[PDB]
Amino acid sequence: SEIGRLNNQSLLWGPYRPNIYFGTRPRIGKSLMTGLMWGKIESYTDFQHTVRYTCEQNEGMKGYGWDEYDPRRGGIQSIHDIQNGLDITTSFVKIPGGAHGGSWAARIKGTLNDDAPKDQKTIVVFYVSQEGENSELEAVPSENEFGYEGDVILKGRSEALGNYKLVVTKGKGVIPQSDHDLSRLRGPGQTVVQSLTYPDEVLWQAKPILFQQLKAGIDWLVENKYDVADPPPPWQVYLLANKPGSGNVHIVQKVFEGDFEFDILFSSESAGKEVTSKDLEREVKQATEVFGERFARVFDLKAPFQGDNYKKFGKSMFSNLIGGIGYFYGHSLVDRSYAPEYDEENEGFWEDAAEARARHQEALEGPYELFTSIPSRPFFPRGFLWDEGFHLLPIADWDIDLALEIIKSWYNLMDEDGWIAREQILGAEARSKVPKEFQTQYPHYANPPTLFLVLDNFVERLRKLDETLSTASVDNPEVGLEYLRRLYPLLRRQFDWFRKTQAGDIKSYDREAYSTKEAYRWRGRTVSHCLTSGLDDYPRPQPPHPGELHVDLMSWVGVMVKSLISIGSLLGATEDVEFYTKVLDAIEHNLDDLHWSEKEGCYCDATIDEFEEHKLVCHKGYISLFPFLTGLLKPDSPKLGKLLALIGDESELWSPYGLRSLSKKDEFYGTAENYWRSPVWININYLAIVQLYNIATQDGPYKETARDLYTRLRKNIVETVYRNWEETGFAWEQYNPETGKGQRTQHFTGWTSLVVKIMSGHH
Numbered sequence: 001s002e003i004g005r006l007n008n009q010s011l012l013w014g015p016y017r018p019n020i021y022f023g024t025r026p027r028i029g030k031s032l033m034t035g036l037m038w039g040k041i042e043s044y045t046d047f048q049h050t051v052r053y054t055c056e057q058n059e060g061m062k063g064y065g066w067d068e069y070d071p072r073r074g075g076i077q078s079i080h081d082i083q084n085g086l087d088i089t090t091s092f093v094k095i096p097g098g099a100h101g102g103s104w105a106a107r108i109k110g111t112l113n114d115d116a117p118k119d120q121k122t123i124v125v126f127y128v129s130q131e132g133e134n135s136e137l138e139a140v141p142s143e144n145e146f147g148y149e150g151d152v153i154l155k156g157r158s159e160a161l162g163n164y165k166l167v168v169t170k171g172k173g174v175i176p177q178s179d180h181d182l183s184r185l186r187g188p189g190q191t192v193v194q195s196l197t198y199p200d201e202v203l204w205q206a207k208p209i210l211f212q213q214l215k216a217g218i219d220w221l222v223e224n225k226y227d228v229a230d231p232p233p234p235w236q237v238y239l240l241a242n243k244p245g246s247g248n249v250h251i252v253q254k255v256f257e258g259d260f261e262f263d264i265l266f267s268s269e270s271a272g273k274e275v276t277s278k279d280l281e282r283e284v285k286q287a288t289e290v291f292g293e294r295f296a297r298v299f300d301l302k303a304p305f306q307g308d309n310y311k312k313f314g315k316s317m318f319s320n321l322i323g324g325i326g327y328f329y330g331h332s333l334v335d336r337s338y339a340p341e342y343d344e345e346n347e348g349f350w351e352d353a354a355e356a357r358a359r360h361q362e363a364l365e366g367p368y369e370l371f372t373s374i375p376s377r378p379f380f381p382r383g384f385l386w387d388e389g390f391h392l393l394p395i396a397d398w399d400i401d402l403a404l405e406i407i408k409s410w411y412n413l414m415d416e417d418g419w420i421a422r423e424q425i426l427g428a429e430a431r432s433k434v435p436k437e438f439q440t441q442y443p444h445y446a447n448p449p450t451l452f453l454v455l456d457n458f459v460e461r462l463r464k465l466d467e468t469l470s471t472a473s474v475d476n477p478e479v480g481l482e483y484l485r486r487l488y489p490l491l492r493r494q495f496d497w498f499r500k501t502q503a504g505d506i507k508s509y510d511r512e513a514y515s516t517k518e519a520y521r522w523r524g525r526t527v528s529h530c531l532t533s534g535l536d537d538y539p540r541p542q543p544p545h546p547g548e549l550h551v552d553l554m555s556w557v558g559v560m561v562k563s564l565i566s567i568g569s570l571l572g573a574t575e576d577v578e579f580y581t582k583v584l585d586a587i588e589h590n591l592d593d594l595h596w597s598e599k600e601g602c603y604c605d606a607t608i609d610e611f612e613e614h615k616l617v618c619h620k621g622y623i624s625l626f627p628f629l630t631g632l633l634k635p636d637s638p639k640l641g642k643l644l645a646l647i648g649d650e651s652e653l654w655s656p657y658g659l660r661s662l663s664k665k666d667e668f669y670g671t672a673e674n675y676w677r678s679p680v681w682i683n684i685n686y687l688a689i690v691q692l693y694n695i696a697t698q699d700g701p702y703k704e705t706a707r708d709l710y711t712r713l714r715k716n717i718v719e720t721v722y723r724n725w726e727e728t729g730f731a732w733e734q735y736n737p738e739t740g741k742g743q744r745t746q747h748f749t750g751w752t753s754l755v756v757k758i759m760s761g762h763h
């Protein structure tokens with residue numbers, strides 16, 4: 001509770017706007033937010049097309065991301081913008097002090113690349129907004145007529161932040177000067193500020209708000225007889241008339257010719273003295289040193305990746321993953337009808353659920369907040385539930401207390417029933433990027449509970465001030481068990497929810513098995529998809545059917561029970577721990593009785609026939625290995641040995657680049673969208689690698705096959721991801737098993753970053 005508050009104060013500020021190139025906000029719903037924009041201007045019409053704000057990936061952008069980041073200290077981002085002929089650095093740094101979550105500073109540096117005209121004009125904007133009823137923010141006017149020769153100071157106050165100043169410094173670089181008539185009314189060229197107000201809920205729409213002000217400037221030109229007989233230069237036509245004041249939006253605009261840089265200094269008044277540029281430089285150099293020392297300790301890359309090339313690779317994958325951390329706030333869109341069609345209980349259920357959806361009873365609810373890492377800045381800058389379990393495995397190593405914060409944040413979303421939506425789209429900003437037909441969440445939709453994996457790691461670590469704070473929840477056992485105590489009931493609630501909502505049907509068919517209880521079927525499947533399982537288009541029983549059972553789902557339930565055993569045991573929930581033991585024992589038996597195929601040598605999902613009998617449906621691939629991947633099989637199990645055969649078999653799963661999602665022998669190989677029907681995916685490869693290492697560092701019959709497989713798979717996965725990074729600068733979503741090429745989306749940090757932990761090893 002004391003450590004909680006120090007943790008709160010430490011993590012309050014950051015560049016928690018991963019959906020944009022660079023911006024800051026604190027972990028507060030309605031507060032002070034900033035964002036960077038820039039774009040070259042060569043003509044009277046180009047700036048609207050060159051300006052950058054929200055993250056994307058296309059031919060115009062070579063690459064971007066964090067070179068180093070720790071959300072407690074700050075870091076350095078590099079942006080390589082081809083369209084704008086610019087290489088940009090954004091350094092962000094936090095300075096603890098006072099009562100309001102400390103201070104921070106950022107340096108924005110732009111260097112023209114070799115291709116750029118040496119006299120390029122670049123428009124740079126720093127956009128500042130503040131939400132809240134009783135808060136103030138004011139631009140201190142300049143001494144000069146038309147703008148600022150020097151720094152722009154914003155004075156503001158709020159309940160959340162107390163008093164603060166935000167300074168945008170004069171910076172360094174040529175500022176262009178205009179000889180035109182207009183300069184007599186608009187100045188020759190200088191930094192300008194517009195202070196505006198809009199209703200709070202639209203402050204986020206920085207691009208349109210800016211353009212509306214640019215447009216009003218141009219309309220003013222037109223009305224005041226500035227025309228094509230004698231036009232002012234483009235960059236002056238797009239320079240806002242200076243009008244500072246008070247409001248909830250403040251636009252600070254600069255134009256530079258050539259290279260440039262400028263600082264942003266946020267000074268929390270309740271702290272000591274105010275933040276300077278010399279402070280920024282010192283704290284930046286200091287963060288880099290701490291970052292370095294920590295990486296070497298936490299991510300000690302083992303053979304054969306100890307080389308410096310692999311270190312830089314590892315730093316990039318890690319920094320981008322942990323650098324994705326966002327704070328999201330607002331309403332989510334949920335169908336709360338619990339239409340009976342969603343029980344999916346007859347044949348052809350998918351058509352019924354389509355009928356219910358077509359009622360559109362979904363409503364906004366909340367608001368909610370979420371502090372989480374994300375799969376990708378340009379495409380998926382929001383919380384995804386099973387993804388986050390993978391994101392936190394490397395993050396927890398770095399800073400267990402951060403990871404627990406993020407777990408707590410997710411768990412705080414769980415409704416009364418035990419449901420967390422698998423995709424968290426919080427507020428209009430988060431919604432803007434996401435197509436309407438994809439926003440609505442459904443309380444019957446599960447997603448893998450991979451967050452338990454992180455919990456498991458915490459538990460084993462538990463059994464055996466930024467320095468201190470990162471590890472306080474393990475160094476103080478008292479704190480640990482207390483965290484577990486408070487979360488334990490939500491864990492159980494989620495357990496029970498799986499069993500009530502994702503229940504399969506044994507009792508109503510000719511189905512025999514050790515337990516009449518244990519059987520699971522993901523709700524929400526369509527003819528070609530099962531989105532809730534995480535493996536979108538992995539082939540399942542055709543047609544889908546209320547009788548289906550899914551071996552991945554049962555294995556996840558297995559993961560959960562096992563975690564509940566350890567956590568219950570740590571808390572002495574004896575009555576609970578005994579029930580869990582009966583479920584574990586029953587899932588073990590039932591995985592065999594309902595899922596094992598002796599004929600095929602692997603696990604399979606099941607349905608019920610045209611003739612109403614249990615049928616196995618075997619599609620050799622990730623799904624086939626689940627009981628192994630999820631840690632459920634004994635190290636001497638013959639079944640495990642056969643899965644090891646399947647895994648290593650080059651003609652089924654084993655490619656030089658990692659395990660294929662689907663066997664080359666399956667009829668569904670490389671068909672359709674071919675998402676999970678052949679490509680190599682790091683998250684599942686990671687689970688294989690960890691399980692091989694387990695069977696490998698224990699006496700048993702398969703110790704040495706596992707040792708060989710472990711060695712080679714670790715090598716193949718790391719090298720594929722590394723080679724692609726070296727060539728393209730990106731982490732990719734998935735990798736082509738025939739060519740080794742990364743494909744689908746880029747900037748996937750993202751569970752692809754698991755590679756840093758594969759390299760570092762020692763599970």
Ligand SMILES: CS(=O)(=O)c1cc(NCc2ccc(CN3C[C@H](O)[C@@H](O)[C@H](O)[C@H]3CO)cc2)cc(-c2cccnn2)c1
Pocket residue numbers: 375378379380381384386387433434435438534535536745
């Ligand atoms: C044409 S698109 O670029 O594919 C595309 C698609 C969709 N909607 C569906 C979708 C959602 C997430 C994933 C990735 N991935 C698939 C994995 O199978 C799951 O296991 C993972 O949990 C899941 C998360 O990592 C894939 C598909 C949204 C946007 C978008 C959203 C905001 C802003 N701009 N664009 C773009």
